[PDB]
Amino acid sequence: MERYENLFAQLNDRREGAFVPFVTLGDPGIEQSLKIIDTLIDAGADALELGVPFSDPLADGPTIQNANLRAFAAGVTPAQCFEMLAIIREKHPTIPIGLLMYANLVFNNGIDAFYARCEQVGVDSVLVADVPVEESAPFRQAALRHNIAPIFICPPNADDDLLRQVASYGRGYTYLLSRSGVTGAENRGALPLHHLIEKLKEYHAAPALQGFGISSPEQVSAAVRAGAAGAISGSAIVKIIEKNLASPKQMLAELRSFVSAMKAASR
Amino acid sequence: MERYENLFAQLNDRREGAFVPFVTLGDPGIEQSLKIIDTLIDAGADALELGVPFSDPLADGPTIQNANLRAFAAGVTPAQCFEMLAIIREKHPTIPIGLLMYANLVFNNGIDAFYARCEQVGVDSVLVADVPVEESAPFRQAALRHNIAPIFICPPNADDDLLRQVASYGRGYTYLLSRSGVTGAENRGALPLHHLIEKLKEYHAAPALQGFGISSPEQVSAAVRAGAAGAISGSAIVKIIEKNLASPKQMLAELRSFVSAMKAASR
Amino acid sequence: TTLLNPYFGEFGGMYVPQILMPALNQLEEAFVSAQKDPEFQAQFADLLKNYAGRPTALTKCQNITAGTRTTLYLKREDLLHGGAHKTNQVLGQALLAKRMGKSEIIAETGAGQHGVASALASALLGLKCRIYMGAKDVERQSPNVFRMRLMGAEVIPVHSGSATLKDACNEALRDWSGSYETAHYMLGTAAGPHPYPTIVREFQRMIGEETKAQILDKEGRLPDAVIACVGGGSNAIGMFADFINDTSVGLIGVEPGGHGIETGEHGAPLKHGRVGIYFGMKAPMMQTADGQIEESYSISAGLDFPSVGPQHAYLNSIGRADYVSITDDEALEAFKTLCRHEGIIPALESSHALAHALKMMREQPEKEQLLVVNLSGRGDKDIFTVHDIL
Amino acid sequence: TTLLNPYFGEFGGMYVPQILMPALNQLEEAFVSAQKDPEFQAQFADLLKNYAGRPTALTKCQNITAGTRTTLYLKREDLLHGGAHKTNQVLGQALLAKRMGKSEIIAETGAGQHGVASALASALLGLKCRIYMGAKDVERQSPNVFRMRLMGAEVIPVHSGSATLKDACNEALRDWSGSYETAHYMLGTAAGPHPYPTIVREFQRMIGEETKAQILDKEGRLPDAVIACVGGGSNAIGMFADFINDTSVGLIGVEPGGHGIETGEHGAPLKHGRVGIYFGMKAPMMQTADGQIEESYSISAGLDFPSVGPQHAYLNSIGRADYVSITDDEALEAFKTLCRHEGIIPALESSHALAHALKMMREQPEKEQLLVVNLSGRGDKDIFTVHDIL
Numbered sequence A, B: 001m002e003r004y005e006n007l008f009a010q011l012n013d014r015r016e017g018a019f020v021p022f023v024t025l026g027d028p029g030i031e032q033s034l035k036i037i038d039t040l041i042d043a044g045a046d047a048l049e050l051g052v053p054f055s056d057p058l059a060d061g062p063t064i065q066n067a068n069l070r071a072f073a074a075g076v077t078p079a080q081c082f083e084m085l086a087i088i089r090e091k092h093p094t095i096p097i098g099l100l101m102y103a104n105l106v107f108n109n110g111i112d113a114f115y116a117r118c119e120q121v122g123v124d125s126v127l128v129a130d131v132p133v134e135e136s137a138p139f140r141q142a143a144l145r146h147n148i149a150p151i152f153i154c155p156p157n158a159d160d161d162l163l164r165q166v167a168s169y170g171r172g173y174t175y176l177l178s179r180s181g182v183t184g185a186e187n188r189g190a191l192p193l194h195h196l197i198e199k200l201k202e203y204h205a206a207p208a209l210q211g212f213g214i215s216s217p218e219q220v221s222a223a224v225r226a227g228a229a230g231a232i233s234g235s236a237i238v239k240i241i242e243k244n245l246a247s248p249k250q251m252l253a254e255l256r257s258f259v260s261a262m263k264a265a266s267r
Numbered sequence C, D: 001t002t003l004l005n006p007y008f009g010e011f012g013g014m015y016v017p018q019i020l021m022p023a024l025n026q027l028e029e030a031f032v033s034a035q036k037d038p039e040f041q042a043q044f045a046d047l048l049k050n051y052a053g054r055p056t057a058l059t060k061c062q063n064i065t066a067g068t069r070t071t072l073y074l075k076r077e078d079l080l081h082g083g084a085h086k087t088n089q090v091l092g093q094a095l096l097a098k099r100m101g102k103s104e105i106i107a108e109t110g111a112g113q114h115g116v117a118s119a120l121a122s123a124l125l126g127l128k129c130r131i132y133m134g135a136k137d138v139e140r141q142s143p144n145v146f147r148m149r150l151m152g153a154e155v156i157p158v159h160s161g162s163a164t165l166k167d168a169c170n171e172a173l174r175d176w177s178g179s180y181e182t183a184h185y186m187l188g189t190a191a192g193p194h195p196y197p198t199i200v201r202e203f204q205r206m207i208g209e210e211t212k213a214q215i216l217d218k219e220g221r222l223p224d225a226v227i228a229c230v231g232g233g234s235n236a237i238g239m240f241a242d243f244i245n246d247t248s249v250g251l252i253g254v255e256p257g258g259h260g261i262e263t264g265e266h267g268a269p270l271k272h273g274r275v276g277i278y279f280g281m282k283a284p285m286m287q288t289a290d291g292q293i294e295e296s297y298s299i300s301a302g303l304d305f306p307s308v309g310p311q312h313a314y315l316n317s318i319g320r321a322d323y324v325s326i327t328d329d330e331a332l333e334a335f336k337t338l339c340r341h342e343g344i345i346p347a348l349e350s351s352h353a354l355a356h357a358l359k360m361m362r363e364q365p366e367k368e369q370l371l372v373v374n375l376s377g378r379g380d381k382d383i384f385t386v387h388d389i390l
């Protein structure tokens, strides 16, 4: 399949950037997480970035640490996540679905088997957060054998050799980090990313989605203006979950309002 | 004065040994201790051996440790002991009164001054328990300048040089230890003391009083038969105090009964 | 690209987010440079000798072995400043931090010994130290926490996950992911992403070097085996390293068997766990069937690292080293035996190593064998634990 | 009659009941013989080196002295096996006990460090050890009491008198008065009846001998002064002994000033008590006006001996050594300062010595001076005390 390529073509025809929310699958329970995801899509998400609960999420700040804790309190397992993913794909045939995973969950039962399972349920891409390019060979090879785009992070401290590698190896989109650190809506990246963005385009990298710290409409429009293809927002979304745990209905209303606003900013 | 010499002459004329009780001055209070002492004399004590309460009585077993604790609970001081001694001498003009002291109380305000105070109140002798012959020079010299007999212990582990020294330096009586260890009525000496006794007489030592562990009449008669001039009993007496603290009248009756019995055994 | 191989066979690697790779490459290059630098080597040796108290004694234990043909020596890391072998490598890492121009230290700790060690080195060398510690561990190690603070380090409780060592490991890496330009991460064992397994072995290898010279002096030959406990693998690789090429010398590492391997309440991932990828490396891990990382269990708090150094997994795979386990009750028995027969109170960690030596002796008392146990630390810290059990 | 002079000027002597004099003469003769015996000297040196961890380091403290003209070294007895200097002399006394054919050891202890030391030496050397300890001290030193028992010693609480160190001293002597044929009394400081002051100095004098060689190596000259705390006097005489004939080297001993000398709640009998006769010797004592012996008060439990070694009273009288005092708050400040600036936790006893060095530096910061402080022990035992105060 070529869902990212079809999306970015469509968006380019409308001179629009992508708005891509992140949530942790199963936070705060399977049924509510499925409803959350449908709301994100109905309110204008162009693609999804989705996490699988893990015991030791070392690239995540407290907001996402807490989403994982909530999912674990609900008993959420990787196998349950895969069933959710199949169900999400059965409802929504074209939206790109990307996973953001920790290495041990990919390697656990065999790297090839993980990518095969992603292809069976309809996932389009996988970013493994704790696998740098230097260790990526078996992951990217397995991804490509199963028609899954392997995603790499382009960090702010990237040198030219890394840009070339990222551009060569990645598919679907390039994850352009806003800043150093871990995920979190509190901490906004402010570094100029124009140069990295141009260098990636020069090297024919997959289109760039800016992520980490994106929590407001003006940051979506800023990312698109700098030349990125879009932006990812996770902690900001997850905080709406955390603040509304006691009112599931109000939780969906606020998610709708926020995603609608963030998506409007990409146009 | 020559109270020990007069006593031993008198006793020799009656073929009798001396019976000499020990108590701690001021145990269990000044007034009761004075009454205890008068009872010991009325019941037949030939001489007295008297302790002054001290913080660290390292030659004493638990019975006498406790007498010291009781005297301290009553606030008994060395100066109060000296007043008691003067009063005891004023009541009883001929009985030999010997002190058994720890060194620090003798050295505290000056060794010479201590012996001078003993002469002023009428004491006849002083044994300093933690001064061996090798350290005795200033003590014996001060004693002799103030007409006080310096007493030495002849231990069971005594060699010939020690016997000669004890015989040369001592006056009044020689303290013949029944055994190694510390004071206490529980532990009876059983070593044959005949040889030490003969050697002391050969060297013209002061007459021997056996002490430590003497708690029964048969031990008094045994000491006299072996050639000693008498016997000292302290813990046995002190235990009668300790067991009768709640009945001062019964305490004096039992002390009378015991001293009478011990004195009868010396005849 | 790296200067040194990041793998020991299939184990090891550099599984960190991309943003931390420059910090690892910088550290590897600083280390390679320091190892050829006579001034760095002289400075490290001076602190080891005149501050930490090296060389440490090699003590023969004839009362323990009486009546048998075992001769047993203990390498006395319990006499090193701080009471455990960890002091050796924190001093070298502190010096590497200064060589790179860093002024701040981040460290993780479980039982607290690594945190005390990191705080003391940082106090001596003028570095600002912050320590991450699982909140459950903070609660049960109040003495160590107070020592760290007396030494001027900041101790930050970690409440995420299981609130124990692995979660402090995560938090340390989250911090470094944002502060690597000014801060060095002073990792506490011979594990984690390259180059840490290699640097920690080389900054502990004086344990084995001294042992070799000491045993040759006293017995005129090498040991039949050297025996060491394995929490994360630092004291054991420091003892083993100099003997790896001496093929006649056995290398035995002892993981904690806890309540017994069959109970599942143990800390023996090398022989009884499953390979995974966590904490920057591919190595045997304590983990569930679905791949969630779990804790190690031992009566000894310091054998709590839920994985093991990749060099040990490699030495095991090729059969150069053998790994076994010792239970809580076996370790307690060895602790009691050393106290009573040699007047040395061993750490409950080290007691695992001594317990396995005692089994080698007792099971074949007429076998002639010259054994060295690495006595990795002192056990004054363990007397309450032992008192309460007993 | 004795082989060696039992007095240091007017101080010292053998003020024990006559029954104990043969035991003292026997011990003096065994000691004189051992000191000329190459095999005894080799055996003692071997235990000191390979069991206890001698020589101990001499550590320069540049962070503490920055900005001043003081250079300060610490002699690291905190790194000796057991954590304090007491281990040196219990090993020698254990060997003297065996030389005389004795199989049992009696010892007293206040804070417990001497009891642990005696128990460890007795465990190593096959002696049956019994320890006397004031019941008030038993209650407040549960850790030490448990260490003694883990090492196989019998600990007997003493309830007489004040139920503290002096009363344990008495009880030890009462026992020996009855058991001297089979038991050696392993006295805990350089005090008591001759020959103990002399034997304990000679079995501690390697502290000063090593210091001298170490300072000559590092600075090419002797110290301007060596500074040590004075509880009973052992660590201080062990540091001072080798420098007594080096007239340019100051010898400063530091008694505990407690709450302040003027309060009367102190432990400084050498400069603020009165000479008496107790514990077998004539020496300055804490005592009332009527001559009853009293306790020493200090925040540090181990500076509790209510008198002082007769050699110190003699060195003071002739002006070869100078004695001063340091209060509880000064000792606490020095403890905090060493932890934070050098990463070493000092015993609160040793902290008195370090506090006086810090005053010498701070009061005249432009005076050039090379100082050695005897760091008599480690302070891990004192962290609760310090935590509670703070």
Ligand SMILES: *Cc1c(COP(=O)(O)O)cnc(C)c1O
Pocket (backbone or CB within 6 Å): C083, C084, C085, C086, C113, C114, C188, C189, C190, C229, C230, C231, C232, C233, C234, C235, C236, C302, C303, C347, C349, C350, C376, C377, C378
């Ligand atoms: C920390 C510690 C250990 C365990 O760590 P390793 O890295 O496996 O050596 C073992 N012994 C002691 C005394 C420790 O402090």
Ligand SMILES: *Cc1c(COP(=O)(O)O)cnc(C)c1O
Pocket (backbone or CB within 6 Å): D083, D084, D085, D086, D113, D114, D188, D189, D190, D229, D230, D231, D232, D233, D234, D235, D236, D302, D303, D347, D349, D350, D376, D377, D378
């Ligand atoms: C016992 C002790 C002291 C006091 O005793 P001294 O005989 O005066 O040395 C001092 N420092 C430490 C660490 C001790 O354990």
Ligand SMILES: O=P(O)(O)OC[C@@H](O)CO
Pocket (backbone or CB within 6 Å): A022, A049, A064, A100, A182, A183, A184, A185, A211, A212, A213, A214, A232, A233, A234, A235, A236
């Ligand atoms: O928005 P943040 O800072 O949580 O960063 C995005 C990540 O969660 C997911 O891609």
Ligand SMILES: O=P(O)(O)OC[C@@H](O)CO
Pocket (backbone or CB within 6 Å): B022, B049, B064, B100, B182, B183, B184, B185, B211, B212, B213, B214, B232, B233, B234, B235, B236
């Ligand atoms: O009878 P004892 O054993 O107390 O010994 C006597 C001493 O108290 C006094 O001389």
Ligand code: NA
Pocket (backbone or CB within 6 Å): C230, C231, C232, C267, C268, C269, C296, C303, C304, C305, C306, C307, C308
């Ligand atoms: Na482990």
Ligand code: NA
Pocket (backbone or CB within 6 Å): D230, D231, D232, D267, D268, D269, D296, D303, D304, D305, D306, D307, D308
């Ligand atoms: Na003192």
